[PDB]
């Protein structure tokens, strides 16, 4: 419809934009390039976000991934208590 309606508008030479008619049309229908494009700038690609055998696979992958996630919780407590203990003994 953009291609079609553009192939029906007799647009003037882009060196001769009829500002007399544009300033009629953009007050009659209320259209405003300095409000419309000013909303459009603020709507970019980063304004939007995402949110048998395959079951046996996904369960097996979950078994390994939770086991490794919990080892990565274990060592993540061990380091911290050992760090804060040494950090106290230093000033003593």
């Amino acid at each position: 419809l953009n291609d079609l309606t553009s192939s029906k508008t007799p647009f003037s030479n882009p060196l001769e934009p009829n500002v007399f008619q544009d300033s009629k049309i953009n007050r009659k229908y209320g259209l405003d390039p300095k409000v419309l494009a000013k909303n459009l700038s603020n709507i970019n690609t980063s304004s939007f976000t995402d949110v048998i055998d395959g079951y046996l696979k996904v369960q097996f992958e979950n078994i390994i991934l939770n086991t490794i996630c919990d080892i990565q919780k274990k060592t993540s407590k061990e380091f911290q208590s050992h760090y804060e203990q040494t950090s106290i003994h230093d000033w003593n």
Binding site: T45, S46, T49, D50, V51, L56, F60, I63, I64, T67, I68, C69, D70, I71, Q72, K74, T75, E78, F79, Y83, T86, S87, D90
Partner: protein, 367 residues
């Protein structure tokens, strides 16, 4: 010697042994693990490591079955030294000899590294020294240089480098192994600016525009068809693990001028990367949008200020004559001013600090 058909049948069985081992540990609280099952699986793994006709998937299910039995031992069950030293040799093989070409499944080397770390994090400290393979640190250092150079692709080597640095952080529980970390030059290796992961490890996230630019500029061929959720940087976690490694290594080495030297050389090469985490507190003073300051970034400052608190314990006069001691004095005063402001504005601490990820939210919910 005569039928490939035994491979996939043994694979469909190791798939079933793996399935049954999990369903046992997830159902019975194990007061004592069956050492005959652990022995049978240790021999079957050692046999699978002797015979490159056996498919790598068989070994991966046996390693998974063993890991699921091992961390489900009670914390007062020490494993028999004959089964542990059998495992340590076979686990070393899957770390020293990756390339028998086809590339190996890198999940096997990483799973062997996790099982090795779990075995270290269950032992007599004085027993590990009587079971250590000499070549293990030298080939872990090669595996670290190769993974910090991304030689298998940006998501594979990130897991390898992460797993090796956690294994190394568990080795730092031992003085005599930490002394070996200096002469295996593992700090001088982490000072190396040739390591490609450095380029990808400034920021705690990645932008939307980086992800197309940093793939189109790499994949010029090989035509295989196939609220904002910011993709937290996986190589920043490797930078957190490198700074934690140095904070573990320092403790047994309070007398080592080789530690003070290699630490000074790491502080010399990574200087302005170590300073960026402090001088960001000038930039937010005017016009930067209100980014959600994560606990991971405040923990990076907990670690880096501890690294400077360690370095300021040992510095002979020749280091105090460097501008780096005027620069550390400047950074300490900048950060003390910006923290004196933020510690008066208790409201800044209560509006801007959100626990973001499903795992950050889960740690608060557990504790």
């Amino acid at each position: 010697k005569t039928l490939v058909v035994r491979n996939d049948i043994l694979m469909f069985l190791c798939e079933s042994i793996s399935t049954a081992s999990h369903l046992w540990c997830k159902s019975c609280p194990i007061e004592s693990v069956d050492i005959e099952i652990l022995s049978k699986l240790s021999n079957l793994l050692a046999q699978c490591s002797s015979n490159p006709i056996l498919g790598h998937s068989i070994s991966y299910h046996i390693l998974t079955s063993i890991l699921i039995l091992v961390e489900n031992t009670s914390q007062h069950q020490y494993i028999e030294i004959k089964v542990f030293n059998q495992l340590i040799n076979t686990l070393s093989l899957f770390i020293t000899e990756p390339h028998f070409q086809k590339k190996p499944l890198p999940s096997i080397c990483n799973l062997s590294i996790y099982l090795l770390q779990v075995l270290i994090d269950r032992l007599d400290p004085n027993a590990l020294i009587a079971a250590f393979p000499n070549n293990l640190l030298e080939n872990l250092a090669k595996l670290l240089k190769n993974s910090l150079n991304m030689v298998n692709g940006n998501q594979i080597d990130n897991i390898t480098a992460s797993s090796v640095l956690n294994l190394l952080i568990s080795f730092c529980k031992q003085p005599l192994v930490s002394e070996q970390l200096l002469d295996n030059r593992i700090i001088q290796l982490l000072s190396d600016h040739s390591l490609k992961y450095l380029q990808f490890s400034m920021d705690p996230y990645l932008a939307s525009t980086e992800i197309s630019a940093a793939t189109a500029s790499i994949y010029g061929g090989i035509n295989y068809y196939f609220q904002f959720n910011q993709k937290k940087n996986k190589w920043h976690r490797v930078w957190t693990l490198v700074i934690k490694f140095l904070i573990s290594v320092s403790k047994p080495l309070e007398s080592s001028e080789r530690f003070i030297e290699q630490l000074s050389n790491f502080i010399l090469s990574h200087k302005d990367r170590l300073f960026y985490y402090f001088d960001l507190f000038n930039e937010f003073g005017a016009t930067q949008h209100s980014q959600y300051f994560t606990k991971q970034w405040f923990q990076q400052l907990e670690y880096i200020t501890s690294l400077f608190s360690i370095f300021t314990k040992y510095t002979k006069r020749y280091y105090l004559s460097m501008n780096i001691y005027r620069e550390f004095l400047s950074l300490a005063y900048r950060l003390l001013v910006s923290i004196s402001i933020q510690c008066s504005e208790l409201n800044f601490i209560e509006n801007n600090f959100i626990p973001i990820t499903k795992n950050e939210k889960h740690k608060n919910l557990v504790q």
